[PDB]
Amino acid sequence: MIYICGECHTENEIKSRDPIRCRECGYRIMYKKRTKRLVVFDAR
Amino acid sequence: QTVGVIVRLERETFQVLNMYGKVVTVRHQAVTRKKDNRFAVALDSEQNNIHVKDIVKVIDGPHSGREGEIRHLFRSFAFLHCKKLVENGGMFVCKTRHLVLANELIGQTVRISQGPYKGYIGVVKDATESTARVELHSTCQTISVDRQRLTTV
Amino acid sequence: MIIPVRCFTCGKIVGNKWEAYLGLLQAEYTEGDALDALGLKRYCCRRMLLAHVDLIEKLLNYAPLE
Amino acid sequence: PYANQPTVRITELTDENVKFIIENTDLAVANSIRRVFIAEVPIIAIDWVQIDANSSVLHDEFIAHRLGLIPLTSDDIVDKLQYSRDCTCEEFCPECSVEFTLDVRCNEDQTRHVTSRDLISNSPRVIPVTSRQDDILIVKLRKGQELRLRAYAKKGFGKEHAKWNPTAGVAFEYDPDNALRHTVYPKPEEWPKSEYSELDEDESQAPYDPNGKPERFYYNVESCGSLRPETIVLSALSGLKKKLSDLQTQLSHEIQSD
Amino acid sequence: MNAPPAFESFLLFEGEKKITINKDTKVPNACLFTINKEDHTLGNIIKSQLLKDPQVLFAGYKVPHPLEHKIIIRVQTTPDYSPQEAFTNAITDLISELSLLEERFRVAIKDKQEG
Numbered sequence: 001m002i003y004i005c006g007e008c009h010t011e012n013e014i015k016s017r018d019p020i021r022c023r024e025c026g027y028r029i030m031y032k033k034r035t036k037r038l039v040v041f042d043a044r
Numbered sequence: 045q046t047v048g049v050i051v052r053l054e055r056e057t058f059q060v061l062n063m064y065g066k067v068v069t070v071r072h073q074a075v076t077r078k079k080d081n082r083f084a085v086a087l088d089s090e091q092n093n094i095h096v097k098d099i100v101k102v103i104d105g106p107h108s109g110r111e112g113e114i115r116h117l118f119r120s121f122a123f124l125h126c127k128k129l130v131e132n133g134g135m136f137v138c139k140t141r142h143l144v145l146a147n148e149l150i151g152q153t154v155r156i157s158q159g160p161y162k163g164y165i166g167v168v169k170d171a172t173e174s175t176a177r178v179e180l181h182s183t184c185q186t187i188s189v190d191r192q193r194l195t196t197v
Numbered sequence: 198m199i200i201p202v203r204c205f206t207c208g209k210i211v212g213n214k215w216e217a218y219l220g221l222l223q224a225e226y227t228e229g230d231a232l233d234a235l236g237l238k239r240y241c242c243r244r245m246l247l248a249h250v251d252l253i254e255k256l257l258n259y260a261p262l263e
Numbered sequence: 264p265y266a267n268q269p270t271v272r273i274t275e276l277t278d279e280n281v282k283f284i285i286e287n288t289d290l291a292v293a294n295s296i297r298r299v300f301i302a303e304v305p306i307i308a309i310d311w312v313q314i315d316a317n318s319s320v321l322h323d324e325f326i327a328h329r330l331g332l333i334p335l336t337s338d339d340i341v342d343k344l345q346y347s348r349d350c351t352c353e354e355f356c357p358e359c360s361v362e363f364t365l366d367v368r369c370n371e372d373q374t375r376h377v378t379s380r381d382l383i384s385n386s387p388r389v390i391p392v393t394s395r396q397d398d399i400l401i402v403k404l405r406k407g408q409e410l411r412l413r414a415y416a417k418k419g420f421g422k423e424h425a426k427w428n429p430t431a432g433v434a435f436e437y438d439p440d441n442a443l444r445h446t447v448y449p450k451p452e453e454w455p456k457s458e459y460s461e462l463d464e465d466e467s468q469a470p471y472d473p474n475g476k477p478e479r480f481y482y483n484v485e486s487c488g489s490l491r492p493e494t495i496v497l498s499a500l501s502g503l504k505k506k507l508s509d510l511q512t513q514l515s516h517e518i519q520s521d
Numbered sequence: 522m523n524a525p526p527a528f529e530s531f532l533l534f535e536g537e538k539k540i541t542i543n544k545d546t547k548v549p550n551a552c553l554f555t556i557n558k559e560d561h562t563l564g565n566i567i568k569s570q571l572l573k574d575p576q577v578l579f580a581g582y583k584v585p586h587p588l589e590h591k592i593i594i595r596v597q598t599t600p601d602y603s604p605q606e607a608f609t610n611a612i613t614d615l616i617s618e619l620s621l622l623e624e625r626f627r628v629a630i631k632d633k634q635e636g
C-alpha cells in the first residue's frame with residue numbers, strides 16, 4: 001500500500017502491522033492515495 | 045455435516061443421537077445450538093407432505109412399524125419422539141422416504157445503459173433476477189433498475 | 198472560493214471576467230467603470246464580480262499533499 | 264381558423280443579442296415563446312465527467328459543476344445530435360455526445376490558470392465558446408497539482424438543468440405606456456419610462472384603453488454563447504411547434520381510441 | 522435524498538399516457554384533457570387559442586400541483602361542436618401561427634443581416 005507522507009509528500013510503501021513513519025523524514029502522519037476505482041459525476 | 049438431538053443430559057457431557065441412528069457422547073462445548081427449521085416440508089413414500097407435530101407411522105428402516113410425532117426435520121432424515129419407546133427417551137431418527145402420514149452482481153460496479161439513467165455509474169447494493177438496486181455514484185440516492193439496462197464495467 | 202462560471206440570476210458568463218476585472222482595477226478604474234467596461238449591465242451580473250471573494254488565492258498558499 | 268397573423272420586426276441583431284418586436288399575437292403565445300427560450304431550446308453542455316486525477320484545492324464535484332456550466336458552440340450540431348436516452352449506443356457515441364478531455368499539470372512556480380482553453384474536444388465544431396474576451400476559468404493550480412479528466416457533453420434543454428439554458432437575459436415586455444392598466448401605479452410620476460415608451464416627458468401613462476389587449480411584445484434575447492441569438496429564437500419556434508405537433512399526434516390517437 | 526430526477530418533469534415513464542380525455546358529466550359538451558409531462562407553456566397557449574374560438578363556452582387550464590407535472594384543460598363548447606374538435610382546431614391554429622411566425626422571423630433575420 002502507498003501512503004503519501006504529510007510534510008515531505010513522498011510516497012511510502014509499507015505492509016500491514018508496520019508502524020506509520022516516513023522512510024525519509026520520519027514524519028508519521030500519512031494519507032492514502034486517491035482510489036483507482038472509476039469515479040463519475042454528472043456535471044450538475 | 046451432521047446434526048443431532050440431545051437424548052440425555054450429564055454433568056459435563058451429553059449423549060446425542062446423530063442423523064445416522066447412533067447415539068454418541070459429546071461435550072457441552074462440542075456442539076452449537078442449531079436454529080430450528082420448524083417449517084420444513086418432506087416427502088414420504090407416497091408423496092404426502094409431512095410436517096412437524098404430525099402423527100406418522102414408520103414403515104421402513106430400522107424403526108419400521110413404529111409410530112411417533114415429528115420433532116425436527118432435515119434433508120433426508122426425520123427426527124421422531126414416541127412415548128412408548130424406552131430407547132433414548134423415545135428418540136429415534138428415520139429416513140423421510142421411510143415414513144407414511146398417519147449474488148454475483150452485488151458489489152460489482154455497474155453502468156446504466158438504457159433508459160433515462162443511461163450513463164450513470166453505480167454499485168449494486170442488492171440484486172435479484174429481475175431488478176437490481178444501483179447505488180449511484182453521481183447522486184445521493186439508490187435507484188432500482190432492471191438488469192437488462194445494466195452493463196458491468 | 199473561485200468566481201462562478203454563470204451569474205446565478207440570469208446565467209451570463211462571469212467566469213472569464215474576474216482576471217480582466219482585477220486588471221481593470223489595477224488600471225485605476227473605479228469598480229463601476231470596470232463593470233461597465235466588461236459588459237456587465239444588469240445589476241445581477243455586476244454583483245457577481247463586485248461581491249466575489251477570491252478564496253482560491255488563499256487556498257493556494259498551502260502546499261499540495263502530492 | 265382563428266389563428267393569429269403575427270409579424271416580426273428585428274430592431275437589433277449582434278453576435279450576443281436580438282432585439283425584436285412581435286406584433287398581432289397573443290400574450291400567451293408570447294410568454295410561451297419566452298419560456299421556451301429559457302427551458303426548451305436544446306444545446307450541448309457537459310453532463311458526464313470522470314476524473315482520473317484531481318490534486319487541486321477544489322474537490323471533484325466542484326470541478327464537474329464548473330465544467331457543466333461552460334457553454335459549448337452548439338450551432339448546427341445540436342439539431343443533428345441525438346439524446347443519450349434516445350440513442351441506441353451502449354455508453355456514448357458521436358451520434359449523441361461530444362468527447363472532451365483535459366490534462367493540465369502545473370510544474371512552474373507561478374499559478375496555472377486551468378481555463379476553458381484547456382478543454383480539448385474531438386469534434387472541431389463543438390468547442391468552448393471563449394475558445395472560438397478571456398477564457399472561462401475552471402480552476403487554479405499550484406505547483407505539483409494536477410487535473411486530468413474525461414468528459415462527455417450531451418444534448419438537453421433548460422427544463423432539465425440550467426446549464427442547458429442557452430440565454431443569459433430574456434428581456435420581455437409589452438404595453439410600455441401602461442395603456443391596458445395591467446399594472447397600476449400608485450404614483451405614476453415616480454416611475455421611469457421604458458426604452459419603447461412612446462410618451463412625451465410631461466406624460467406618465469398612456470390614456471386607458473378599455474378595448475385594448477396585449478398585441479405588441481418587445482424581446483431582447485441575449486445569448487450565453489452556445490447558439491447565435493437568432494438561432495435560439497428559431498429553435499424555440501421549431502421546438503414549440505414540435506411539442507404541439509406531438510401533442511396533436513397523441514390527441515389524434517386518444518380520439519380514435521375512443 | 523427525496524430529490525426527483527430532472528427528467529421526470531418532461532419524460533413519460535413506461536405505461537404513462539400523454540393525453541387522456543374524460544367527459545365530465547356536470548355540464549353538456551364539456552371535456553377534461555389531462556396532459557402528462559407538460560406545464561404552463563402549452564396550457565397557456567392552448568387555453569388562449571381556445572378562448573379565441575367563438576364556439577367554445579369555457580376554456581381553462583390548471584396545474585393541480587407544481588411538484589407534479591400534469592396539466593388539466595377543461596373545454597366546454599356549444600352543443601353543435603365537440604371539445605375534442607375544439608382542442609384539435611386550437612392546436613392546428615397554434616401550429617399554423619407558429620410556422621408563419623418562424624418563416625417571417627427568418628425573412629426578417631435575412632433582411633437585418635443583408636441590410
Ligand SMILES: [Zn+2]
Pocket residue numbers: 005006007008009010022023024025026027
Ligand atoms: Zn516524509
Ligand SMILES: [Zn+2]
Pocket residue numbers: 204205206207208209239241242243
Ligand atoms: Zn446576471
Ligand SMILES: [Zn+2]
Pocket residue numbers: 345347350351352354355356357358359360
Ligand atoms: Zn449514442
